[PDB]
Amino acid sequence: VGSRTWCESEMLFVQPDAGTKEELYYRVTPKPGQTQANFNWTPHKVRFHDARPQRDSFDLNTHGFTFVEDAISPQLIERIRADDTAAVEGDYFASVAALVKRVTGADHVVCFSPYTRKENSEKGIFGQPARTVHCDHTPAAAIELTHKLCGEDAVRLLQSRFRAFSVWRPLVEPVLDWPLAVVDGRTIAPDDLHPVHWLRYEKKDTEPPFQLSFSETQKWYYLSRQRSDEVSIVKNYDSEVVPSPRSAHCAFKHPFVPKDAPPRESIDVRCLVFGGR
Ligand SMILES: COC(=O)[C@@H]1C(=O)C(C)=C2O[C@@]3(C[C@]2(C)[C@H]1C)[C@@H](C)CC[C@H]1C(C)(C)OC(=O)CC[C@@]13C
Ligand SMILES: O=C(O)CCC(=O)C(=O)O
């Protein structure tokens, strides 16, 4: 079940054969009598390798994720846990953009779609830890978001280095239960990827994310006891041919944490990233 540097748990995947017929969709809040989806989630046991002993070795080009030290003030953290929207869209966005610029050297970073999560929250499923394995954007979705956020400039930006990240930070520390797991992007096979339309509304309203199916080839990691000063950057899209075009991520129930541990709290923000290395 566990050893010094790994543990075992489960996550929700899609079937390897999902989406070979029609487009997959999942309704977030289906009405009575409405069909919720044309596929089922399937749990699979996964071995989670602790990234802690090799923390500084993981790289956004090689692995599709990286961990970076970046302390923020206790007051910004309490403002965020208080759902202070102005603190998120102002101070925290600025913090994330600046962090991403240190890490990559990018010329331009655009933050969007922040989600503050709390273990079995009341703000719905996007305010709760993610239980299905996903990559936030397909290429089409990343391209669409660049047009939507960057206007005219997109015609030039989309032809050089373009990346999209999820930037994830614990708001209570250390994280014990429901840690964010990330996969070595070199171990994702193209057939593991399944676009799924998340219907927040009656109709498709954006381009979709990828949901993953399980494979024994996938090498899954987690950073044990992650602190509020330790930020996970998880790559959802990259225009450059690098060993990991993307990673994928999801939370899992940790087998060795006490039942009565406090709820996990975190904030994640997506970012479009232009230029850099
Ligand atoms: C339990 O829900 C999760 O596990 C994930 C989640 O928590 C969130 C917040 C999501 O946002 C998505 C899809 C995921 C990754 C889901 C799978 C949808 C639901 C709304 C925002 C869009 C958007 C920003 C328009 O960009 C897109 O490319 C389309 C997909 C996302 C990123
Ligand atoms: O906090 C979680 O459980 C999921 C976070 C996430 O999906 C993201 O950062 O894109």
Ligand SMILES: [Fe+3]
């Ligand atoms: Fe995500």
